[PDB]
Amino acid sequence: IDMEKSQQALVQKRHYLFDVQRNNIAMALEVTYRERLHRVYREVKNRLDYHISV
Amino acid sequence: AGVGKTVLIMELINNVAKAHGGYSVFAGVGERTREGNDLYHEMIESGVINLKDATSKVALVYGQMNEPPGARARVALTGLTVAEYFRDQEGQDVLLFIDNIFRFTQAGSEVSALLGRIPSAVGYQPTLATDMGTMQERITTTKKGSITSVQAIYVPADDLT
Amino acid sequence: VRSSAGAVRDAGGAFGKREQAEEERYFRARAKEQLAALKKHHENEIS
Amino acid sequence: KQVAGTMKLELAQYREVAAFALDAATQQLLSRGVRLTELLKQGQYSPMAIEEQVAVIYAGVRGYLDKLEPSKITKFENAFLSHVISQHQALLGKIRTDGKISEESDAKLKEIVTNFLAGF
Amino acid sequence: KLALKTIDWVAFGEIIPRNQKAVANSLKSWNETLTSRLATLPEKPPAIDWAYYKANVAKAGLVDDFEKKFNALKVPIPEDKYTAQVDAEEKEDVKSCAEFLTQSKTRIQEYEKELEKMRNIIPFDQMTIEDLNEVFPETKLDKKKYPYWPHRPIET
Amino acid sequence: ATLKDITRRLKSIKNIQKITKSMKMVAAAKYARAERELKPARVYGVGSLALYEKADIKTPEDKKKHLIIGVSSDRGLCGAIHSSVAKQMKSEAANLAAAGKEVKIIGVGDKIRSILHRTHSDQFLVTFKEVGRRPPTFGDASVIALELLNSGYEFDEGSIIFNRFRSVISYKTEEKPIFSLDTISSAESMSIYDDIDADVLRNYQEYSLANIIYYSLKESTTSEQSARMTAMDNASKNASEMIDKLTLTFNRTRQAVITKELIEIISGAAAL
Ligand SMILES: Nc1ncnc2c1ncn2[C@@H]1O[C@H](COP(=O)(O)OP(=O)(O)O)[C@@H](O)[C@H]1O
Numbered sequence A: 001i002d003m004e005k006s007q008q009a010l011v012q013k014r015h016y017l018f019d020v021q022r023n024n025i026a027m028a029l030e031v032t033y034r035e036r037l038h039r040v041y042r043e044v045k046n047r048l049d050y051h052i053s054v
Numbered sequence B: 001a002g003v004g005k006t007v008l009i010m011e012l013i014n015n016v017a018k019a020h021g022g023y024s025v026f027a028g029v030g031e032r033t034r035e036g037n038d039l040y041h042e043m044i045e046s047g048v049i050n051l052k053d054a055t056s057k058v059a060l061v062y063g064q065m066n067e068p069p070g071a072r073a074r075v076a077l078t079g080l081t082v083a084e085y086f087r088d089q090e091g092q093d094v095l096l097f098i099d100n101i102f103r104f105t106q107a108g109s110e111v112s113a114l115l116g117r118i119p120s121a122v123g124y125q126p127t128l129a130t131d132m133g134t135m136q137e138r139i140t141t142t143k144k145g146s147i148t149s150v151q152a153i154y155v156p157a158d159d160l161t
Numbered sequence C: 001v002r003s004s005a006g007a008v009r010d011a012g013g014a015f016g017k018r019e020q021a022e023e024e025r026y027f028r029a030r031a032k033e034q035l036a037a038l039k040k041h042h043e044n045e046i047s
Numbered sequence D: 001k002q003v004a005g006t007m008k009l010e011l012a013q014y015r016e017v018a019a020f021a022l023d024a025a026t027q028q029l030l031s032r033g034v035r036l037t038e039l040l041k042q043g044q045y046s047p048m049a050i051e052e053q054v055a056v057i058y059a060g061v062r063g064y065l066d067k068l069e070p071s072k073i074t075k076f077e078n079a080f081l082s083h084v085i086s087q088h089q090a091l092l093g094k095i096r097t098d099g100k101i102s103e104e105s106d107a108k109l110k111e112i113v114t115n116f117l118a119g120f
Numbered sequence E: 001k002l003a004l005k006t007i008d009w010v011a012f013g014e015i016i017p018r019n020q021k022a023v024a025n026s027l028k029s030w031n032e033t034l035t036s037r038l039a040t041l042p043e044k045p046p047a048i049d050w051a052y053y054k055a056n057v058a059k060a061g062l063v064d065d066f067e068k069k070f071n072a073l074k075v076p077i078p079e080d081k082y083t084a085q086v087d088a089e090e091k092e093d094v095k096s097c098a099e100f101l102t103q104s105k106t107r108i109q110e111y112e113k114e115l116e117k118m119r120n121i122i123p124f125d126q127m128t129i130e131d132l133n134e135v136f137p138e139t140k141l142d143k144k145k146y147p148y149w150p151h152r153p154i155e156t
Numbered sequence F: 001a002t003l004k005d006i007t008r009r010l011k012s013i014k015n016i017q018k019i020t021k022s023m024k025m026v027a028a029a030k031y032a033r034a035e036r037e038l039k040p041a042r043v044y045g046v047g048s049l050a051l052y053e054k055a056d057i058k059t060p061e062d063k064k065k066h067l068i069i070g071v072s073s074d075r076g077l078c079g080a081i082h083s084s085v086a087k088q089m090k091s092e093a094a095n096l097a098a099a100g101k102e103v104k105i106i107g108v109g110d111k112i113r114s115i116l117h118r119t120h121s122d123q124f125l126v127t128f129k130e131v132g133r134r135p136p137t138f139g140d141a142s143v144i145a146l147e148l149l150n151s152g153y154e155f156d157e158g159s160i161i162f163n164r165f166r167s168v169i170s171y172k173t174e175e176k177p178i179f180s181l182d183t184i185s186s187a188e189s190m191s192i193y194d195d196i197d198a199d200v201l202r203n204y205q206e207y208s209l210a211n212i213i214y215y216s217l218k219e220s221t222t223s224e225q226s227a228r229m230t231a232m233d234n235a236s237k238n239a240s241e242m243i244d245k246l247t248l249t250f251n252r253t254r255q256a257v258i259t260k261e262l263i264e265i266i267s268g269a270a271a272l
């Protein structure tokens, strides 16, 4: 009885794997966004620096 | 260096000097000025040096390692003179702590080559033994007084030879 | 040129550290045993 | 001052019995010494704030890492910081401002380390 | 923007079958790398001082045009197509709550039924061979293989 | 290095050489004594083995329980004695467990235990230490056999690995089978032997177990002392070569230091 009751009480919370996946994919999207913004900034700064330094 | 010379001599000042009726002299010869300030404040806290009354029991002479060799080679003689006076005229027991007495020799060695003397042994002045003797021979317990002299002696590179 | 007693640990090479450890482990063990015996004697002499 | 003192004693004891490599007590002493040693390593041009050093050294010296393998310690170290630096900024700010591991700060640190160790 | 739900890990380690730990550990590691990257990446892109950059360039017009094109043009963002794992959650709603939950509850019910049936029986001091025959069919000396006395094998 | 580094190293190596020479002499004396004692024990143990090679006994092929005993010692500095013994012990254990057996291990001497405490750490039925301090006797073999029989691991087969002492310079690692009465009774050859119930035979098996343990102990101690003598001789020779090289280096460094100080003095004198 105890084995079965604890098994049920435990498998109740199997949702953490999906919650992980959720926040992990959110993190992936955020890092992509950050890289996009930094890449555009770096390119514009590179061209400006080229002009200024020449 | 770093074995406990200064800590041991400070411990001796804490013990013998604190409970010693007679006077006391401390000659810092070519040692860190940080340590001189620390000792000044530690004595002020303990009470051997009293800045208010005239009950001080310690006389300090300092010629630290920022001084040119001429001053390091003679601050030992200055402290020794103060101790000698307290030994004779006062006719009483004295303690005399010196830290270190190797800086007297070393400071003597930093000017010898410029005074025209050929160096001896491991680049020491030819008059090492005589110069050290003419000083260490005034730190003595004559029949008129009594100097207990504690000396810290740096040993360059742990080399006792 | 001669040799003197207590020179293996004066060099401080590899034999010096090896000897130091061989000594320290043994006396740590013996200290543990003696401390256990001391506790036992304490308890047995409380009464 | 609180933490590095115990770390200093532990490394001092470890260095005596290090030249070789039995009983539980000295085996655990060597284990703790090695854990602390791999804790003290560091990279280049990445100095750590004093509170972060305190957190790492506390985790290492309170016998928590004694379960982990030593070759993995560095991992933990890095990971641990990247966790504490985001979720528990408040605790690090507390340690910095008050400048001591108070009893409540110690209890927190304890629960954070216990949780993180298992989850890793 | 960011307010990630907290995760317990000792709990996360309680719900992965042995056949699946090989992906659970990889998910843990890949979350770790993503977290480290996010911490490494700044809260904001650093500001710009367009005035100075335009004030040290002969063709101020060209850099002004760069600035204006920067002002007009933004950047794109990814979506949730890769997040199709949405569907997975619904499937779980069947096992842990419809199939596994219901079957487990039925097994539980059977287990209690057995429990009280076993707990409620007369003291042995009055019981009879028949009583053990019903309650415990394991004591029934099968006559389908051992007819003649003692039914229980002589070699035992 | 500098002159003081070389001086300290040279002194340390000289002390090490002295110690290794003394240890060679001690080991040689103990070896002479152990060989002298080994002769009678050699004949005694060979006689005790007599039966099993006179009435050939083939171990049963339907049993899984085996025992491995490995005789060595606590002392180190004996070269490849403990190493060879433990190597062959793990070879045999692997072969048995691959053929499908339930092997245990008894280690007479720490060094075997240590060599085998990483792998085979759970098969230790029991291990004995305090070996090698004094020459082994029949008391030691009786104690080992008694603590083997008492520890109720009724084995179905046995092997003992020791370093048979060939010559002062050479030794061999042996494996001597040890049988249980379950095998002696169930042997056609044993049908001939008269007045052979299963109780006198059991006492005989216990005594033969003690006998083989004693034989292995004597052979092992003889070979161990010989190996320690050889190892100390080689260590002293290596220390002598190192001392020669370091003395040459020390002379070079001493002369160089004299010349350096003298040139400093000369330069100072001429630079006034
Ligand atoms: N009694 C002592 N107990 C513990 N540590 C000491 C003691 N004396 C000296 N030390 C150590 O030595 C250092 C101070 O050495 P010090 O005596 O000032 O140098 P030196 O003797 O070369 O002048 C301290 O940092 C301390 O760690």
Ligand SMILES: [Mg+2]
Residues within 6 Å of the ligand: B005, B006, B031
């Ligand atoms: Mg000092």
